[PDB]
Structure formats: structure tokens, C-alpha cells
């Protein structure tokens, strides 16, 4: 019975010590509890947006920490089965670092233009039998134009649980794991990407080890 | 390739009922992963209407106790002339040190805080 | 996980209060093609070009004083019921050290 990979590692929360990779202090030190102006604030973003500091929204640190924990746990347990994670960042704020982290890990990124269907019509531009991404981590869903990334609709149109670093200008309508947080500060995105790299790397390492030990049975 | 219409909201129940039907012969893999770690706010496809009339958004305005201290410091004396780093957490300098000293001396005053304010100002300036 | 109240209270962006006529010092977060977007915490970074008086010391990890003026920069134009953000600050530069 080599099917223990679908039971043993899933019967525990934060098995890879995901709660220790970050914390409330780690977020407070990176200025993640910030938000853009409250002018174009989204309706469904009000519960997350705790307060404001003169046209500057502030998000509760506990909610953001819990969302980060859940999203990282899900991403790790998905990579535990070669879960093809997909990054998105068209704002050009940290596309270089995001691509470098994706290279260091086994995930991929889609920080370029969305042509004639890259996920809904991936049978023509690519091969016929191509496993589509089972997870999308929107690093910067807000592109240069006043409009969120269109990949959310494509993901919803293909049954894909997506993660997103949502903010005040975002629209967490169909995101399965919204991650409220700041997107203007550089240290915030740096910490985000470092945590992602470490988490996915540890997930892949534990995957290899445990899968080998189980198949050896 | 599964039910993807965003009319309900979450895809977990969609895939579950589809597998129960008989279409999806073999499950993918994320089933147990989602079953073990469910989300906080489920993406229930709700009409994202715009706040029109009295539909207000009770969003409290954050205001700390140091607001009055900073107002007095910048009204009595000049504006912020000290170089602030603001990179590393809880950085300290001269104006930040003065604000910290004021917060330490507040409350526990009752009598008059302007006396201690002027005292600290004269000690820092002369 | 320490105290959530103290951490939310004592923070750089909240400690600086309403940025207005505050000389802030910082470094450049990313070299620009022909500009000088110097960072300094806060909510946004200033925007300007290289000055004529000493314009070489500006390096990725330096310390140059700024002024911080209007960290929002927004204005409801005509029919736009919402705001039009620019993600800038625009402040008068002082010098080096």
C-alpha cells in the first residue's frame, strides 16, 4: 500500500513548520499591514481593511497572518504532488525577482501578456496533453492599467484554486485564498518572495524524501 | 473538463458532485489537500454591487495617542528636520527619541504636559 | 508572535505620523533609466532626476535626505467617481548627508 502520501502527510497542520517561517513580527517588520487609498476601495475588501490612516488603509495583522499560513500550507501540500504553481506579476515591480525565485524552484510564472487563451485554449498554442497549472499565486494581480489581472477568470473557467496577494484595489470575488497585504513597499514583496521560495523548496524536498521512503515499501 | 461556470462560487463542491455523478472517472489530487485546509472566506459568487445610497462601510479611522504630541511638537517648534530612516523596524533618531520620551512621560502627568514638553525641548536644543 | 497591539502601535509608518515637511533619509530601491526614485519607507517614494550638484554618490544602499511632500497625490477629475492614483510622492531634494 504505497498510497500513504494521500493520508499521512495530510493528517497534520503545518507539517513543514510553515507557521515558523513567518509570524506577526515578520509582517510588522515588512510593512505588510498597509493599503492603497480608500477611493477605489472594493466592496468585499471592507472586512479585511481594518482601519485607515488619512486615506491610507491598514489591514489587521492577524487576518493576514492566518491567510498567509493557509495559502502557504496549501501551496506546499500541492507541490507535494508536483502541483504546478503559476506566478503572475505584470506590474513590473518585482518580475525579475519573481522569475528568479521561480527558476530556483520548480514552479513557473506568467508575468507576460495573456495571448489568445494561455490556460483555456492551451491545446493549440501548446501540445494536446499538457497538465495545466493546479494553483496560481498572483504575485501582483494589479497590472499597470486600472484593472486586475484577467487570469482570475481564466482560472475560474478551468477549476484551479488560485492564491492572490490581494489589496484594496483588488476584487477578491473568486480567489480561493485571498492574501491581503501591501504591494507598494519593496521589503514586503521581498519577504513574500523569500517565503514562497523557502516554502516551495522545503515542500519539494519533503516530497522527494517521503515519496522515496514510501515507494521503497 | 469539469464544471467551471462561476455561478456558485467554490470549485470543491462542484468537483465533488461531478465525481459523485460519474463523469470524472479519476480524481485529480487537490481533493484531500483542500479537504485538509479549507479557506477562511469562501469565494461565494456574490453580486459585487457598488455602494450607492446609505450602504455605508463602517471603516474606523486609525488615530494614536502620539497624534497630539506630534501636533504640539511641530506647532511650537519647527517641522520634522531630523533624518528618518524608516527602513528597519522601530528606528530611532532625535525626533523619534523625543516622541518616545514624551510617550514615556504620558500619561502620569495630569498637571500639565506643556511643562515637560518645554523642558525636553530646551534640553535637546540647549 | 508577540503582542499585536504594541506592534501595530510602534511602527515606522505609524511613528512618522502624517508625513508633511519631514526630512526623511533613505536609499534608492532600483536604478532608473534616467531618473532617481529614492526610497525612504513611508507609503510611496519620491520621483526626480539626478541633480547637478554631486550626482554619483546615489547608490543602491546609500543615505540621502529628502523632504516628503504629499504621499498620496490624487484628485477626482470629471466623472471618475473613484480616485486616480499615481504611486508617487514628489518632494524637493536637499543633498547628500
Amino acid at each position: 500500500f504505497n498510497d500513504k502520501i494521500l493520508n499521512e502527510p495530510l493528517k497534520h497542520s503545518d507539517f513543514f513548520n510553515v507557521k515558523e517561517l513567518f509570524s506577526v513580527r515578520s509582517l510588522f517588520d515588512a510593512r505588510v499591514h498597509l493599503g492603497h487609498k480608500a477611493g477605489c476601495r472594493h466592496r468585499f475588501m471592507e472586512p479585511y481593511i481594518f482601519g485607515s490612516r488619512l486615506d491610507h488603509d491598514i489591514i489587521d495583522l492577524e487576518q493576514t497572518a492566518t491567510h498567509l499560513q493557509l495559502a502557504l500550507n496549501f501551496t506546499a501540500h500541492m507541490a507535494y504532488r508536483k502541483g504546478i504553481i503559476l506566478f503572475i506579476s505584470r506590474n513590473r515591480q518585482f518580475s525579475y525577482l519573481i522569475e528568479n525565485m521561480a527558476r530556483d524552484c520548480g514552479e513557473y510564472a506568467h508575468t507576460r501578456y495573456f495571448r489568445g487563451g494561455m490556460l483555456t485554449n492551451a491545446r493549440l498554442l501548446f501540445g494536446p496533453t499538457v497538465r495545466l497549472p493546479d494553483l496560481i499565486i498572483f504575485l501582483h494581480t494589479l497590472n499597470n492599467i486600472f484593472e486586475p489581472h484577467v487570469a482570475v477568470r481564466d482560472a475560474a473557467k478551468m477549476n484551479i484554486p488560485t492564491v492572490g496577494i490581494v489589496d484594496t484595489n483588488c476584487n477578491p470575488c473568486l480567489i480561493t485564498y485571498p492574501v491581503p497585504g501591501n504591494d507598494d513597499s519593496p521589503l514586503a514583496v521581498h519577504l513574500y518572495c523569500r517565503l514562497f521560495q523557502t516554502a516551495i523548496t522545503r515542500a519539494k524536498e519533503k516530497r522527494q524524501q517521503v515519496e522515496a521512503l514510501y515507494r521503497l515499501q | 473538463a469539469g464544471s467551471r461556470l462561476e455561478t456558485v462560487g467554490s470549485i470543491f463542491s462542484r468537483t465533488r458532485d461531478l465525481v459523485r455523478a460519474g463523469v470524472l472517472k479519476e480524481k485529480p489530487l487537490w481533493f484531500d489537500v483542500y479537504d485538509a485546509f479549507p479557506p477562511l472566506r469562501e469565494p461565494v459568487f456574490q453580486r459585487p454591487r457598488v455602494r450607492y445610497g446609505k450602504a455605508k462601510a463602517p471603516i474606523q479611522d486609525i488615530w494614536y495617542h502620539e497624534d497630539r504630541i506630534r501636533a504640539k511638537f511641530y506647532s511650537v517648534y519647527g517641522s520634522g528636520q531630523r533624518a528618518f530612516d524608516l527602513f528597519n523596524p522601530n528606528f530611532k533618531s532625535t525626533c523619534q527619541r523625543f516622541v518616545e520620551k514624551y510617550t514615556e512621560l504620558q500619561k502620569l502627568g495630569e498637571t500639565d504636559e506643556e511643562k515637560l514638553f518645554v523642558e525636553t525641548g530646551k534640553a535637546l536644543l540647549a | 508572535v508577540e503582542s499585536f497591539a504594541s506592534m501595530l502601535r510602534h511602527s515606522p509608518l505609524t511613528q512618522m505620523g502624517p508625513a508633511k515637511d519631514k526630512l526623511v533619509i533613505g536609499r534608492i530601491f532600483h536604478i532608473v533609466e534616467n531618473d532617481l526614485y529614492i526610497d525612504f519607507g513611508g507609503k510611496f517614494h519620491c520621483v526626480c532626476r539626478r541633480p547637478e550638484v554631486d550626482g554619483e554618490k546615489y547608490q543602491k544602499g546609500t543615505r540621502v535626505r529628502l523632504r516628503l511632500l504629499d504621499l498620496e497625490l490624487t484628485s477626482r477629475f470629471l466623472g471618475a467617481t473613484t480616485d486616480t492614483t499615481v504611486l508617487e510622492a514628489n518632494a524637493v531634494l536637499l543633498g547628500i548627508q
Partner: peptide, 25 residues
């Protein structure tokens, strides 16, 4: 208690924004 955000009396209030006729008819 004191380290939490509590709406104060709204400081940083500018006096009466007089235009030109501050007190000279």
C-alpha cells in the same frame, strides 16, 4: 488598551480658513 487605534478628537485642525475678510469690513 492604549496601544490600539482609538479615534481621538481629530488633531491637526487648521483655524477658520479665512479668505481675505478676516476681520476688516
Amino acid at each position: 488598551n492604549e496601544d490600539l487605534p482609538i479615534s481621538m478628537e481629530n488633531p491637526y485642525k487648521e483655524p477658520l480658513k479665512k479668505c481675505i475678510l478676516c476681520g476688516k469690513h
